[PDB]
Design an enzyme around this catalytic site. Structure first.
Site, PDB file in Angstrom:
ATOM      1  N   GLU A   1       8.132   1.350  -7.536  1.00  0.00           N
ATOM      2  CA  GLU A   1       7.055   1.155  -6.574  1.00  0.00           C
ATOM      3  C   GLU A   1       7.387   1.444  -5.098  1.00  0.00           C
ATOM      4  O   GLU A   1       6.485   1.705  -4.296  1.00  0.00           O
ATOM      5  CB  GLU A   1       6.482  -0.275  -6.683  1.00  0.00           C
TER       6      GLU A   1
ATOM      7  N   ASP B   1      -2.871   4.233  -4.226  1.00  0.00           N
ATOM      8  CA  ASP B   1      -2.029   4.534  -5.393  1.00  0.00           C
ATOM      9  C   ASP B   1      -2.413   5.875  -5.992  1.00  0.00           C
ATOM     10  O   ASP B   1      -3.213   6.616  -5.421  1.00  0.00           O
ATOM     11  CB  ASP B   1      -2.022   3.440  -6.482  1.00  0.00           C
TER      12      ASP B   1
END
Ligand SMILES: Nc1ncnc2c1ncn2[C@@H]1O[C@H](COP(=O)(O)OP(=O)(O)O)[C@@H](O)[C@H]1O
Ligand SMILES: Nc1ncnc2c1ncn2[C@H]1C[C@]2(CO)CC[C@H]1C2
Length: 486
Positions: free
Chosen positions: A85, A94
């Protein structure tokens, strides 16, 4: 199981090593490198060899540096996810376009940035203005890890698999539920089946075909192999990916095999050797079964003879610049240098620096000794699966040395062209490398062929550079090629 009838001197040094161990004079761990290297000594305490066990390799299972990591067990889920991440201190989107922050923390699937900013102030407890801190991102992070673990254990479909998985695979399942959440991962019911029955290569495929993976393949593939191999290997080198994962000892020996066939004689003799030493790093199991007698198992490694009287290439070249060698000595350096370039080019060394090679500077039936001589050590980073993606990341350092400017001497062409021009020599070279590399349990025929392809492409280039009397530098400017079969 150590015998080398082809090389009785080498065998003799190996026999002193064993004897010294019997006598409890143990190979001592080198401080001066990353740490899976030892100074083998003989019963008189002198340093006869450098030893690099396979399992203590940088990607190695028993590597001292990475054992602490292996202790954590599932507790590696944090680093695992930090790696997947990253960290961001401001709202971003995202892969799917959803508002996110910190370490993979999804704020909302809503398109409104103030929805997201609203959702964020709620979470943090203040007016963030879309921007949070390191500590704030970490606190969201744990909660999100807890929530993932809860999602798995609150669930009837997931929990069974999870309880049956080893510490490392468990971390993989948490990873998914971090990304897709409880309900999402439970729609994989097939793959959960395989994971439950322990069939890894079965399941490693089904996760390969999903809407997931499709979206985030780089990550998905990183998890899939953490599922398949029960190890952290996808998380320690993203990426070298130019080299086979844990075969440096074979590189080391292979480098020495090549030197031998080309008759370069810059590579101190290196072979695949088995040793057991109390000083090595062994699994606790192994430590216990030794009875403290059964004894430690022998480890497989590269055994490289030790040479005395040498200094860093770096060390000497610096001095020759202030106080330049006389033409005749300097020509001995250059001839030694050509042998190095030929070695590195042929095996496609990826990490030769000026610390990775050493210099020693001191009518009739016998040849006067040379004043200067070159040893090529630390060869375990060669034999790549393919040419590096950015030549700048894995260059040939010696290319920027002035010596690299000088045209290949007729002497090297004379030594080298008759061999590498003979297809039966190159064939023979590939059989010898094959007989060497296949001995590894993790050997893969397909991987080998790729290695050879590079090597054959390097040879192709070298042959013509030599015919044309190019410098080493002009040699490396030749566009890299591979010669591929089928
Ligand atoms: N150490 C080295 N290793 C590999 N190639 C080198 C090295 N030093 C110089 N070169 C060569 O010098 C050339 C000059 O850079 P070049 O590749 O033309 O720039 P670009 O990458 O923008 O095309 C390169 O093609 C490269 O192959
Ligand atoms: N075969 C060798 N002979 C002598 N010195 C070596 C050899 N290999 C490595 N070294 C030195 C370079 C080091 C880095 O690998 C730092 C001291 C040792 C090991």
């Amino acid at each position: 199981r150590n015998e080398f009838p082809e090389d009785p001197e080498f065998e003799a040094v190996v026999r002193q090593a064993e004897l010294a161990i019997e006598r409890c004079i143990f190979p001592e761990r080198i401080y001066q490198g990353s740490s899976g290297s030892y100074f083998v000594k003989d019963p008189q305490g002198r340093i006869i060899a450098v030893f690099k066990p396979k399992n203590e390799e940088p990607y190695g299972h028993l590597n001292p540096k990475w054992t602490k990591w292996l202790q954590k067990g599932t507790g590696n889920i944090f680093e695992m996810l930090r790696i997947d991440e990253g960290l961001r201190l401001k709202i971003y989107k995202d892969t799917e376009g959803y508002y996110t922050i910190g370490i993979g923390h999804l704020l909302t699937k809503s398109p409104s940035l103030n929805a997201a900013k609203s959702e964020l102030d709620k979470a943090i407890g203040r007016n963030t203005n879309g921007v949070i801190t390191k500590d704030e991102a970490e606190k969201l992070f744990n909660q999100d890890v807890d929530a993932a673990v809860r999602g798995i254990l609150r669930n009837a479909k997931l929990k069974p698999v999870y309880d049956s998985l080893d510490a490392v695979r468990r971390a993989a399942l948490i990873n998914m539920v971090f990304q897709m959440g409880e309900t999402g991962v439970a729609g994989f019911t097939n793959s959960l089946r395989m994971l439950q029955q322990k069939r890894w290569d079965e399941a490693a495929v089904n996760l390969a075909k999903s809407r997931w993976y499709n979206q985030t393949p780089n990550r998905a593939k990183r998890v899939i192999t953490t599922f398949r191999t029960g190890t952290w290997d996808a998380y320690k080198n993203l990426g070298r990916d130019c080299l086979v994962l844990n075969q440096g000892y074979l590189s080391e020996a292979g480098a020495s095999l090549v030197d031998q066939k080309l008759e370069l004689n810059i590579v101190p003799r290196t072979k695949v050797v088995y040793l057991a030493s109390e000083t090595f790093n062994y699994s606790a199991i192994d430590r216990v079964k030794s009875r403290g007698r059964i004894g430690l198992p022998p480890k497989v490694g590269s055994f490289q003879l030790f040479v005395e009287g040498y200094k860093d290439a770096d060390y000497w070249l610096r001095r020759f610049e202030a106080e330049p060698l006389p033409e005749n000595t300097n020509r001995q350096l250059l001839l030694q240098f050509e042998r190095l370039v030929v070695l590195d080019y042929i095996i496609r060394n990826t990490d030769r620096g000026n610390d990775n090679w050493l210099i020693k500077y001191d009518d009739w039936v016998v040849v006067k000794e040379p004043v200067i001589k070159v040893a090529a050590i630390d060869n375990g980073l060669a034999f790549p699966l393919k040419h590096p993606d950015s030549w700048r990341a894995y260059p040939f350092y010696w290319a920027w040395l002035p010596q690299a400017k000088v045209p290949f001497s007729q002497e090297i062409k004379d030594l080298i062209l008759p061999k590498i021009s003979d297809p039966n020599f190159v064939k023979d070279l590939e059989e010898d490398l094959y007989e060497l590399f296949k001995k590894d349990p993790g050997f893969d025929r397909g991987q080998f062929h790729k290695q050879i392809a590079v090597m054959r492409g390097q040879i192709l280039n070298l042959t013509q550079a030599l015919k044309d009397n190019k410098s080493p530098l002009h040699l490396v400017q030749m566009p890299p090629v591979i010669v591929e079969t089928a």
